[PDB]
Symmetry: D2
Subunit: 331 residues, 4 copies
C-alpha cells in the first residue's frame, strides 16, 4: 500500500484533545515574541495563533512550524476563525488598535472595546474554561473590559499590568548594584504606566531593606536619586520605540514567565493587574497591579502590600481616573 | 557612604574576560531571531550585537536587556565599533547586501565582498580565534568570501548552508508520516537553494530506508510524489516571504542549534557549508553542504556520503557555477 | 487574624487536581534515579512515590522536597497507600528484586510476578486512565504481566525495554566513530537481556549505511569485529553491577526520555516493550522491543522494521524464549 | 581502510584544553547527586570524577556514560589519579570520613584534615586556577582547611555552608504560606547546622516584611511559633538520615545551583561560607555563611546584612568555637 502503511502499523486512530494548549491573539511584534518565548520554554503541547491579517498569520505559523525539529511543541495551528483555539488553558490577548494622530484617550479606548467585543465572545465560546491574560494597552482598562465582556470570575481574568515594569526596575537595580536582577527584589505596582508606584519599602537584596539602609531612598532628598530609576522605567517603552520603532523581546519573555506559573501551577507571585475593589479605600470595579499568586486557576490569592499614605492615595487616584473612563464606555 | 557601598563589600576587582561569548553581526529579522534563540538556550555568558544602523542597534540591545530577569546571560552589549565583540568564541554574520531586481549574481557577490572586506578584518582583529558562522546569502559563496578574507583555517569558517533546508525537509516528512521530525531522518545537501539535493537513499525512520520500501521514491514514477517535498523545501523562503515579508524564526532556531554543538563541543553532525575541494569529485575552492561534525574547533570532520550519478552531477554542476563566479571576484 | 491572613487575601479555595501527575512505585536506586530525572526535566506538576519500606519512603520524599526551591514541580507526596497516586497520567513501576552479579534477569520472574499481583490492581484502582510504564526486571515479561493483570488496552502498557540497550549501543558506536551518540543511529531490538538483536542493516550516520559501506558488518568475519559492540551492550548491566552493585543513572535517563515523549505527546520513535503478535509470523501474545511511536496515548503505532533473514531469525529466537516463560505464568 | 575512515574525512586532530570542566571528588551519595544534577543542567563540557574506591568509581562513570544519548556533556572521565582533573574551572569536594560513634569534634575534623592534606595539593597541582567548592562536613571548618592547604586567595575557596539550610527554610516557609519557595525569601546564615541563624528581619513575600506585619516573628512569645521552622531546618538533616540513612538529592541540587552561578558568571547572591574575618567583631580566620555574589571568579563581593545584637553574638560565638578547633589542628 502507501509508504506510510508499509512503514507504520497503527494501533489507535482515536486522537485526543490537546491537554496543555495555549492561544495567542494578535501576531504583531508582541504576539510573536510571546509565541517564540512560549515555544522555547516548552509550556504547550499545542499553540494556536489568531489574527485578522490572513497572509501575515499564515506566514508566522509556517515560519514557526519550519523550526519544529528544534522544538518540543508538536502542533502549531492558526486561523481567522476561533475554532482553532478550542480548549486552550490560556489565551493571551495582544490584539488592539494603535493610538492615532490626534485621537483622544476615550476614543482610543472605545476602539479597543469595539475590538474586544468581537474577540472575547469568540474566545469564550471555544475555551469557556480558559484563563485570560490581557497584554493589549491600556492594559488595566482592557483587562476590566475583558472581565466585563467575558463574564469570567475574577481569578480567570489577568492583566499583564506591571509585570514588565517590575522586571525593568530589577534590571536597572541590578546594573546599579552589580548584581543579577534575579537577586534584586523590588516591586512596581498600581496602574501600568506613568502613574505606577515603586514600593520603596520592599526594595532589597538578600532580605536587606534598602530603605532601612538609605532612609532617603525614593525621595527628592535622595542623594542617589533612585527616583530616576522608576522614571527610566516609565519612559522605557517610549525610549525603545524611538530607537527601533516598537518593543517585543522583553514583553514576550515577561509574558512567557506568567504562562509558566499558570501552566505549571507554580503559585509564584507576580505583579499583574487584578480586580482591586475593596482595597486601599477603593470601591469601584477597577484592575490594578498587586503581587498575585499565579497557578492552574489563575489568580488564587493576592499579597496585601503595606503601603504608605502617599502610596495608597496614588492608587486611589489611579482607580478614580480609571473608573471615570470606564463608566463612559459603550459595550 | 553610597548605598552600594553600605550594602556590598567588594573582595576583589580583577580579570573579567567572557568565557563563552557570542557576537551577532546584523540585527535585522534574522540576526535578532538568532539572538533570542541563543539567549533562551543559555549558550553564552555574553552576547554582542553589531550593526551600521545605530538607532535600531541600540533599541534591540535595550529591548533584550529589559528581559534580563528572565534570562541567564548576564551581559548584553552592542555598538557599531567592533571592540564590543572582543574575545568571541563564535561570531555569526547575517549582514550583507540585498539583491536589486535586474542585478547579476556576480555583481551582487562583488558588493558583498566589498562589505565583508570591512566586516571580517574587524571581527578577526578582536576575536582572532573565533569560529565564524556565515548566514548571509548566497551563503555558499559568502562563506568562501569570509574564508578568503579572514585567512582562517577551513575548520573555523562555517556556512549555515543546507541546515535549515534539512530541518524543513524533516518537518514535511514528519507531517506526511505522522512522526516527530526528530525521528524522521533525511538530508538535503550541496548548494543551498534551488540547486540543493535531497538524498533519497538516506531518508529513514528507525533505520528503515524509505527508498528500499518504495523504490520509485523521489522519481517521476513516484505515485506519492515525494519529489514535491524537496520542491516545497526549495520554495519555502519565497512562500513565507510572500506571506509575512521576511523569514526569521526557523532560521534563528536552526542557527542556535549549530551554536549549541559548537559552544558545548557536542560533535553532532549537521548539514552545513564547508570547503569541499578534493571530495565528491570537485577540484576548485568551493563551499557546499555535506554532513559535518561540529564542536569547539568548528568543523573537525565531515561525512563522505555515497551519492547517485545524478546527485553527484548536480553537486559538480553547482561547484562549476560557483567557481565560475568566484574566479571573477575582486578582493 | 493569622500572619498568613494579614499577608495574603484569598480569592478562592477548593483544591484542584494535578494536570500532569506522575507516580513512581519503588523508591530504590532505579525509582529515585527516575524521580530526579523526571523532576529536572520539568515533566510533572505532581510527583507521587510509593514503596513498602515506610521510613525509606518518607526520607526519599523529604530529601526531594528539600530541593524544591531548585525544581519546578510544586507538589511531592508519598505513601504506602495507593490513594496518594490517584489521578496519575503516568505510573512508572520500578519495584522488586534486581539481579545480582552474574544472575540472569530471567531468574527474577517468580519474585517479581508475585509483587506485580499486588501492585498492578492497586495502581489501576486509583488511576484507571494512566499509561503504565514498566521498568522492573525482567521488563518484557513483566510488561506482559502488567498488561494481563491491568486489563488495559496494550497501547497504555509500555515496557522501558531496549530504549536503554539502544542508548548504550549508540554510546559505544559514537566512541568508535568519534561522533556524538545523538548523531549515531542504530537499533537493538527484542529482549531487554541476553537475546537482544542488533539491527546491522539500519545502522548509519547522516543516512549513510554502514552495512553498505562495510558488508561484513556484524558478522564473524568482520575484521573490525563490530559484533563485539553488541556483545558489550548485552554484558553492560553485568559489568556495572559487578563494579558498583546495581545500575541506576542510565535507566533513570532512559525512563525520563520515554516519559517526555508520553507527557508532551511528541510522537517520537523509541524501542519499547510491546506485543509483537502479527509481526514476523509471530502468533503468540509475546512482548518485547520494537520501535514504537510514543505519545499521550502511549504506543499509538509500531514501526515495521525490515530485518534480514538472520536478524529476523534472531528476533524470533528471542520471542520463543520469552513466550516460553510468559506462557507458563499463572494469574 | 577502516569503516571510520571510509565514513569520515578528518580536517584536524584537535585537541583543546578543557573549556568548561567540573570535577567532583568523592562519588558517595552526595558526590553522585551533585554529578547528576550538574549533568542535567548542562553546566559542563567535561565532567571528571575522583574517588579512592576504584571499582565503585569506574561503575558510576560507566553508568553515567550509558546515559550520554540523553545528555549534552560529551566527555565524562574518572580516576584515582588527579591527572583526570586537569584544567577544571570548578572542583567540588564531597570526600571525607563519616564521624565515628563517641568521637570528639576535634578528632573527627582532624581525620578529615588528614584526607584533605592529600586531596587538596593534588587538586591544586592539576588545576592551579580553579574555584574550590567544599561540601564535606563539618563544612565551615573544612572550607578553612581547604583554604589553608591550597594557599588560594579567599575568593576561590567556597563552602556550601547555609545554602541548603536556606533552601529548606524557604521550602518550609512556602508550605506554611501556600506559596512557591521561589517567591518565599529568607536567609539562614552563620555556622552550618545546629548553630545557624535565621534572619527574621529578612523574611518576606513580595518585599512585604513578615517581621513588620508580625513583630513577634521568631520570638518566644510568637503565637505561631515560627522559631519551630528554623528548628525544623536544623533537625531536617538528622531526620532524613534517620529515615533513609543519608541525604543526597537536596544537597545535590543546591550544589548545582551554585555551580550554575559560578560557571555562567551570573553574579546571583547565595548564602555560602566565606572567610569572614573583619566582620561582626570577628577577628579570627573563620568561614561563615553570609550572602555572597558568585561568578566566574568565585566570591567577588558579599552583602553586609544588618544583624541585631543577638544575631551578631550568635555569629561571634560560632567563630570563637570554630577557631578554638582550628587553632588545634595539625596540618
Ligand atoms: N502591558 C504591557 O506591558 C505592554 C503592552 N503592549 C501592548 O501590546 C499591544 C500590541 O503590540 P504590537 O504587537 O506592537 O501591535 P501590532 O499592531 O504590531 O500588532 C497587533 C495585532 O493585532 C491584530 N488585531 C487587531 N484587531 C484584531 C482583531 N479584531 N482580531 C484579531 N487580531 C487583531 C493586528 O492585526 C495586529 O497584527 C499593544 O496594544 C501594546 O500596547 C506592548 C508592550 C508592553
Ligand atoms: N542561509 C540561510 O538559510 C538563510 C539566510 N538568510 C539571510 O539572512 C540575511 C539577512 O536577513 P535579514 O535580517 O532579513 O536582512 P536585513 O537587511 O533586514 O538585516 C541585515 C542587517 O545587516 C545590517 N548591515 C548591513 N551592512 C552592514 C555592515 N557593513 N556591518 C554591520 N551590519 C550591516 C543591516 O543594517 C541590517 O540591519 C539575508 O542575507 C538573508 O538572505 C535568510 C534566511 C535563510
Ligand atoms: N529495565 C531496565 O533497564 C532496568 C531495570 N532494573 C530493575 O528495576 C528494579 C529495581 O532495581 P533497584 O531500584 O536497583 O532495586 P532496589 O532494591 O534499590 O529498590 C527496589 C524497591 O522496590 C521496593 N518494593 C519491593 N516490593 C514492593 C511492593 N510490593 N510495592 C512497592 N514497592 C516495593 C523495595 O522496597 C525497594 O525499595 C529491579 O528489578 C531491577 O532489576 C534495573 C536497572 C535497569
Ligand atoms: N554541606 C552540606 O550541607 C552537606 C554535606 N554533606 C557531606 O558530604 C560528605 C559526603 O557524604 P556521603 O556522600 O553521604 O558520604 P559517603 O561516605 O557515602 O561518600 C564519601 C566518599 O568519599 C570518598 N573518599 C574518602 N577518602 C577519599 C580520598 N582521599 N579521595 C577521594 N575520595 C575519598 C569515599 O570513598 C566515599 O566514596 C559528608 O561529609 C557529608 O557530611 C552531606 C549533606 C549535606
Ligand atoms: C502598535 C504599538 N506597539 C507597541 N506599543 C508599546 C507601548 C507601550 C506602552 C506601555 O507599556 O505603557 C505605552 C505606549 C506604547 Cl506605544 C510598546 N510596544 C509596542 N510594540 C505602537 C504604538 C506606537 C508606536 C509604536 C508601536
Ligand atoms: C533581506 C532579505 N531577508 C530575507 N531573505 C530571505 C531569503 C532567503 C533565501 C534563501 O535562503 O535561499 C532566498 C531569498 C530570500 Cl529573499 C529569507 N529571509 C529573510 N529574512 C529579504 C530579501 C527580499 C525580500 C525579503 C527579505
Ligand atoms: C557519611 C555521612 N553522610 C551524610 N551525612 C549527613 C549529615 C549532615 C549533617 C549536617 O548537615 O549538619 C549532620 C550529620 C550528618 Cl550524618 C548528611 N548526608 C549525608 N549523606 C553520614 C554520616 C552518618 C550517618 C549518615 C550519613
Amino acid at each position: 500500500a502507501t509508504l506510510k502503511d508499509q512503514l507504520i502499523y497503527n494501533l489507535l486512530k482515536e486522537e485526543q484533545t490537546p491537554q496543555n494548549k495555549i492561544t495567542v491573539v494578535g501576531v504583531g511584534a508582541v504576539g510573536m515574541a510571546c509565541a517564540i518565548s512560549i515555544l522555547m520554554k516548552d509550556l504547550a503541547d499545542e499553540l494556536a495563533l489568531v489574527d485578522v491579517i490572513e497572509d501575515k498569520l499564515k506566514g508566522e505559523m509556517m515560519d514557526l512550524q519550519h523550526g519544529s525539529l528544534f522544538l518540543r511543541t508538536p502542533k502549531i495551528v492558526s486561523g481567522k476563525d476561533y475554532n482553532v483555539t478550542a480548549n486552550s488553558k490560556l489565551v493571551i490577548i495582544t490584539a488592539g488598535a494603535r493610538q492615532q494622530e490626534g485621537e483622544s484617550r476615550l476614543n482610543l479606548v472605545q476602539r479597543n472595546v469595539n475590538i474586544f467585543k468581537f474577540i472575547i465572545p469568540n474566545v469564550v465560546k471555544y475555551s469557556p474554561n480558559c484563563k485570560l491574560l490581557i497584554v493589549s494597552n491600556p492594559v488595566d482598562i482592557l483587562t476590566y473590559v475583558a472581565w466585563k465582556i467575558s463574564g469570567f470570575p475574577k481569578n480567570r481574568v489577568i492583566g499583564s499590568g506591571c509585570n514588565l515594569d517590575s522586571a525593568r526596575f530589577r534590571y536597572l537595580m541590578g546594573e546599579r548594584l552589580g548584581v543579577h536582577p534575579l537577586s534584586c527584589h523590588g516591586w512596581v505596582l498600581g496602574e501600568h504606566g506613568d502613574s505606577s508606584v515603586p514600593v520603596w519599602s520592599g526594595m532589597n537584596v538578600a532580605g536587606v531593606s534598602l530603605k532601612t539602609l538609605h532612609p532617603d531612598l525614593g525621595t527628592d532628598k535622595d542623594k542617589e536619586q533612585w527616583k530616576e530609576v522608576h522614571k527610566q522605567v516609565v519612559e522605557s517603552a517610549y525610549e525603545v520605540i524611538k530607537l527601533k520603532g516598537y518593543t517585543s523581546w522583553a514583553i514576550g519573555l515577561s509574558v512567557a514567565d506568567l504562562a509558566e506559573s499558570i501552566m505549571k501551577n507554580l503559585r509564584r507571585v507576580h505583579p499583574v493587574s487584578t480586580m482591586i475593589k475593596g482595597l486601599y479605600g477603593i470601591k469601584d470595579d477597577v484592575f490594578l497591579s498587586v503581587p498575585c499568586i499565579l497557578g492552574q486557576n489563575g489568580i488564587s490569592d493576592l499579597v496585601k502590600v503595606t503601603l504608605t499614605s502617599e502610596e495608597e492615595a496614588r492608587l486611589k487616584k489611579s482607580a478614580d481616573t480609571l473608573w471615570g473612563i470606564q463608566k463612559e464606555l459603550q459595550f
